[PDB]
Amino acid sequence: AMRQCAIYGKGGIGKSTTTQNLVAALAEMGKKVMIVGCDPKADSTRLILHSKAQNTIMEMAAEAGTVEDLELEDVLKAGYGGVKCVESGGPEPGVGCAGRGVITAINFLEEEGAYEDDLDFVFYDVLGDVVCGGFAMPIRENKAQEIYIVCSGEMMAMYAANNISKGIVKYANSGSVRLGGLICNSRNTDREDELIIALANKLGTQMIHFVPRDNVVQRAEIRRMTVIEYDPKAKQADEYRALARKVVDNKLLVIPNPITMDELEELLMEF
Amino acid sequence: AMRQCAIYGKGGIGKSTTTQNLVAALAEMGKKVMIVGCDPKADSTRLILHSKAQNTIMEMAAEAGTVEDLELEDVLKAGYGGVKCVESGGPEPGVGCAGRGVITAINFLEEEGAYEDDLDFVFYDVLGDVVCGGFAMPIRENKAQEIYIVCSGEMMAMYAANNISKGIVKYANSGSVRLGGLICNSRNTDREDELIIALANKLGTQMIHFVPRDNVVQRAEIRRMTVIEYDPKAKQADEYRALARKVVDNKLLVIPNPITMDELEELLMEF
Numbered sequence: 301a302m303r304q305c306a307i308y309g310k311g312g313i314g315k316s317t318t319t320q321n322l323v324a325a326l327a328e329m330g331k332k333v334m335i336v337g338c339d340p341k342a343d344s345t346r347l348i349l350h351s352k353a354q355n356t357i358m359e360m361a362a363e364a365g366t367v368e369d370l371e372l373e374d375v376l377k378a379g380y381g382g383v384k385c386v387e388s389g390g391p392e393p394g395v396g397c398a399g400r401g402v403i404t405a406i407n408f409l410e411e412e413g414a415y416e417d418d419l420d421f422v423f424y425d426v427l428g429d430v431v432c433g434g435f436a437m438p439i440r441e442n443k444a445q446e447i448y449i450v451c452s453g454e455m456m457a458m459y460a461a462n463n464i465s466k467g468i469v470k471y472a473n474s475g476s477v478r479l480g481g482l483i484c485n486s487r488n489t490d491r492e493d494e495l496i497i498a499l500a501n502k503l504g505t506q507m508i509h510f511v512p513r514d515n516v517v518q519r520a521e522i523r524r525m526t527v528i529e530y531d532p533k534a535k536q537a538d539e540y541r542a543l544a545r546k547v548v549d550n551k552l553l554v555i556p557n558p559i560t561m562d563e564l565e566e567l568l569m570e571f
Numbered sequence: 572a573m574r575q576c577a578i579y580g581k582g583g584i585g586k587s588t589t590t591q592n593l594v595a596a597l598a599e600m601g602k603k604v605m606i607v608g609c610d611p612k613a614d615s616t617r618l619i620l621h622s623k624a625q626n627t628i629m630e631m632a633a634e635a636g637t638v639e640d641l642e643l644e645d646v647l648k649a650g651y652g653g654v655k656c657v658e659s660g661g662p663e664p665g666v667g668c669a670g671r672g673v674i675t676a677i678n679f680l681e682e683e684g685a686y687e688d689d690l691d692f693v694f695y696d697v698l699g700d701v702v703c704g705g706f707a708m709p710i711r712e713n714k715a716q717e718i719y720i721v722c723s724g725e726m727m728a729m730y731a732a733n734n735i736s737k738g739i740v741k742y743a744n745s746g747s748v749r750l751g752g753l754i755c756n757s758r759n760t761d762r763e764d765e766l767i768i769a770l771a772n773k774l775g776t777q778m779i780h781f782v783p784r785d786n787v788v789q790r791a792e793i794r795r796m797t798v799i800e801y802d803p804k805a806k807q808a809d810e811y812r813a814l815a816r817k818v819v820d821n822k823l824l825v826i827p828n829p830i831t832m833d834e835l836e837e838l839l840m841e842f
């Protein structure tokens with residue numbers, strides 16, 4: 301068995317920082333994990349690899365001729381805790397569908413046998429400002445079984461969570477893609493945890509963890525590390541360990557019930 | 572003559588608040604303006620119309636049969652200062668290209684003669700987290716002659732500015748789409764103005780205005796108004812008037828010079 305999780309959310313909300321720190325905590329626990337970057341920014345694996353970023357499947361396929369000239373062992377790279385890392389890439393801005401590289405990457409990984417029985421988790425880090433093209437592919441094509449949405453008390457972040465939830469509903473008749481929870485990545489506003497708990501309740505899910513805003517994140521990332529590796533004693537390291545434990549133990553996976561714009565505004569009004 | 576401007580930027584950065592307040596200041600000055608919403612959130616005209624949002628061209632076309640059954644005078648709605656407003660709409664999440672409604676809307680407006688000689692400005696409010704499909708159409712198809720990018724000291728906002736700039740470069744051999752400037756929408760961090768001035772200089776443009784963070788914006792928008800209408804005496808109203816004056820007077824329109832990720836990180840490091 302292997303659990304396939306996808307982290308969605310609006311741009312800049314904290315998907316890649318949260319995913320890489322969660323995954324480092326899983327590896328610290330002894331789990332075997334692969335991260336698949338599905339955001340054109342292509343920096344979803346840099347903190348595991350200690351790297352600038354990672355060269356993408358689209359880039360490597362072009363340098364090699366075709367994607368068939370690539371071998372899995374030349375594309376997947378291991379970093380902290382043995383976590384295996386790959387980046388999809390995407391076309392340059394203004395040409396082609398920004399999500400086209402996700403389709404190529406996921407099909408390549410499936411065909412080349414990357415989903416070996418010994419992996420415990422796969423995490424996809426997916427752009428969520430639009431739910432279409434290759435960014436909808438993990439949902440449409442049944443790859444992202446458990447979706448976790450990173451969000452905050454920001455209206456745009458909550459709207460994005462509702463939009464992703466609508467995409468999950470639209471494919472509910474095929475496959476098994478479900479909403480696993482919301483992750484609140486704090487803006488250091490109070491009642492913010494209560495706000496995201498309320499939103500999760502209205503959608504029919506739960507807020508799995510509240511991640512505090514902590515400057516140790518920046519100090520770690522300047523050095524191309526997760527907090528888990530940079531300062532294993534940090535309070536924020538323990539926050540990521542708690543998030544990872546709760547993902548492991550989570551049993552609530554639902555077809556969410558998206559809300560109206562009036563419900564979303566009323567939530568912000570109240571809190 | 573009529574100037575065609577497009578406001579791009581990452582989600583939640585302030586495009587719609589900045590555009591509607593800028594446009595209200597233009598109308599207060601006596602200009603005739605149309606706003607074309609090109610973001611699926613479809614709330615780009617609500618502060619001019621005093622409305623919840625606006626029903627979209629895609630929605631109205633479906634209720635009416637075809638887009639040809641729609642008349643311009645039934646779709647365009649006037650609000651504060653006579654500003655004319657239209658929303659593109661888009662398909663539901665998980666179906667079709669999130670930008671498909673922009674193509675339908677802009678072609679409809681062109682064919683129906685919405686670009687009447689007496690308009691002074693058209694502003695497109697465009698999602699900028701991906702530059703593809705209908706969101707690239709204003710650049711690819713020469714509709715958005717002057718692009719202004721709303722951004723902030725946030726790394727993701729600056730990355731989005733660089734991505735949009737790359738899209739402008741890619742179509743530089745056809746049409747006349749150019750970068751007009753950056754608009755800094757403050758996160759209330761200091762040296763932030765100097766940071767965005769530096770980024771503009773590296774791209775070859777200018778930072779046209781620094782918009783402060785001011786709670787009067789929220790108090791206005793709770794009442795579905797621009798600050799210009801809600802409190803014409805407010806300091807923030809004068810900030811939007813200054814931005815509008817500088818857009819009117821702006822003569823610098825360039826093919827930008829996108830920067831590397833190393834240059835972008837060095838900028839953040841320094842400031």
Ligand SMILES: Nc1ncnc2c1ncn2[C@@H]1O[C@H](COP(=O)(O)OP(=O)(O)O)[C@@H](O)[C@H]1O
Nearest residue numbers: 311312313314315316317318512513514517521
């Ligand atoms: N809990 C946190 N505390 C402090 N900084 C954070 C936190 N989460 C994210 N950040 C910072 O926010 C910025 C954006 O996060 P990132 O994970 O890259 O967003 P995304 O992948 O959603 O675009 C990064 O500079 C990151 O270091």
Ligand SMILES: Nc1ncnc2c1ncn2[C@@H]1O[C@H](COP(=O)(O)OP(=O)(O)O)[C@@H](O)[C@H]1O
Nearest residue numbers: 582583584585586587588589783784785788792
């Ligand atoms: N200068 C500002 N001061 C205070 N709040 C602002 C300012 N600019 C934007 N906001 C708030 O930020 C939120 C997002 O702005 P919006 O224009 O809707 O973003 P976008 O259209 O880019 O998604 C809105 O609640 C808006 O009221």
Ligand SMILES: [Mg+2]
Nearest residue numbers: 315316339344
């Ligand atoms: Mg990311």
Ligand SMILES: [Mg+2]
Nearest residue numbers: 586587610615
């Ligand atoms: Mg908007």
